[PDB]
Amino acid sequence: ENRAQVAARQHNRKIVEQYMHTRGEARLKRHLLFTEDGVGGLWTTDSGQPIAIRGREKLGEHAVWSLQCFPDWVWTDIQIFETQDPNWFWVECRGEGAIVFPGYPRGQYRNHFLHSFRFENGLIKEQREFMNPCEQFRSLGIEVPEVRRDGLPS
Amino acid sequence: ENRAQVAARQHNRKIVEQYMHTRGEARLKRHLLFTEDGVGGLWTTDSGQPIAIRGREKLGEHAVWSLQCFPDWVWTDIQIFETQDPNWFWVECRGEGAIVFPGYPRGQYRNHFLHSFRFENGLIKEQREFMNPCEQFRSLGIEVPEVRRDGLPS
Ligand SMILES: CCCNc1ccc(C(=O)c2c(-c3ccc(O)cc3)sc3cc(O)ccc23)cc1
Ligand SMILES: CCCNc1ccc(C(=O)c2c(-c3ccc(O)cc3)sc3cc(O)ccc23)cc1
């Protein structure tokens, strides 16, 4: 059983590596790293609800929109964390690139991200990314609220 | 070497568990889980810069303000992730409690969190927590910007 867990972890790590280094036109095929019913998404948004895409083929359809809205996106400063679960990885990284959201001025977006990858049968069953939406607001020219600090010492 | 790494991971895990379960008056002594020069803080804020405190004694001083602003805070749904680094852990959890920020109405704050814990010689050298600040804005009655989605399909 330990041999099976070790083998799963090693293979899954290669998939995480491949995902994190998928750039440019290869983004059109990144969905093939998911199970048929795999889910990917952004878990931190202005609404408090995730923007999640469910199903490998729907993830592939979304990559068209991803490549339009973030045409040169790269992940950088990538640190991959294996865990005691051979099917669960975390990644700390940054990401950056142009942001071209319809109805907003073209901007430059940079942020810090955490990703969660859960695997089933050697492919990604659930990917989730987490960031501070305030930095995306800034990239879109959206005013960020400020918490008044007068009575809040650090 | 492997035995030493195994020993470090097992002890460090106990410190993470203790930190995550610390609530109530025990919060006044949570800083004793840190190295003398240890750092803790919130990495996701409206400004884009962390609110971090460096030094065990300064962390202890801050606990007074933590108990004022978050008088009944509890971490729930705790999942601890060991990693390939015996001195690095991640935690996925939620947190909840009253929020009592000076000059804002008293509110009820709930959020999802990720924590990072890095250890040195059996104590926490760096703790960092990550959340979506939009949920904290809501708890304070602060208006959250909304990204227009008319052109952005999911
Ligand atoms: C592959 C799974 C989906 N992955 C993502 C990745 C990034 C985003 C994203 O940046 C955001 C939106 C979006 C929706 C649909 C679309 O076509 C493109 C962008 S709306 C919105 C509001 C905010 O407050 C913050 C971020 C976003 C959304 C989903
Ligand atoms: C030593 C560990 C530091 N740990 C924390 C934990 C939580 C916060 C926090 O919620 C925030 C503030 C705060 C500052 C000083 C203080 O006394 C109490 C609260 S201001 C602010 C603005 C935002 O946009 C979002 C969050 C916060 C800050 C620091």
Author numbering:
A (entry chain A), B (entry chain B): 12 to 165
Lines quoted from the article behind this entry:
Modifications by the enzymes PhzE,34 PhzD,35 and PhzF36,37 lead to the highly reactive aminoketone intermediate AOCHC (2).38 Two AOCHC molecules then condense to the tricyclic phenazine scaffold HHPDC (3), either spontaneously or catalyzed by the enzyme PhzB, which is a homodimer and belongs to the nuclear transport factor 2/ketosteroid isomerase family. can be further converted into different biologically active phenazines such as pyocyanin (4) by the enzymes PhzG,40,41 PhzS,42 and PhzM,43 respectively. PhzB in its homodimerized form displays binding sites for two substrate molecules (2) in each monomer. The C-terminus of one monomer functions as a lid, shielding the binding site of the neighboring monomer and thereby contributing to substrate binding and stabilization of the complex. To this end, we initially confirmed the target by performing cocrystallization of RAL with a PhzB ortholog from Burkholderia cepacia (BcPhzB). The active site of BcPhzB features the same amino acids as the target enzymes from P. aeruginosa (overall sequence identity: 58–59%, sequence alignment: Figure S1) but crystallizes more readily than the P. aeruginosa proteins.
Most ligands interacted similarly to the parent compound RAL. Representative examples of 10i, 11a, and 11e are shown in Figure 4A: the 6-hydroxy group of the parent scaffold forms two hydrogen bonds with Asp57, one with the side chain and one with the backbone, respectively. The carbonyl oxygen of the 3-benzoyl moiety interacts with Gln147. While substituents in the 4-position of the benzoyl moiety (series A) occupy the same subpocket as the 2-ethoxypiperi-dine moiety of RAL, substituents in the 2-position point toward a different region of the active site, which is also the binding site of the substrate analogue 7. The binding pose of the ligand’s core scaffold was observed in two positions, in one of which the 2-phenyl moiety is shifted upward and the 3-benzoyl moiety is rotated compared to RAL and 11a. To prevent a steric clash with the downward-shifted 2-phenyl moiety, the Trp76 in 11a flips, constituting an alternative rotamer without affecting the hydrogen bonds with Asp57, His73, Gln147, and Pro164*. All 4′-alkyl amines 11a–c were active with IC50 values between 3–4 μM.
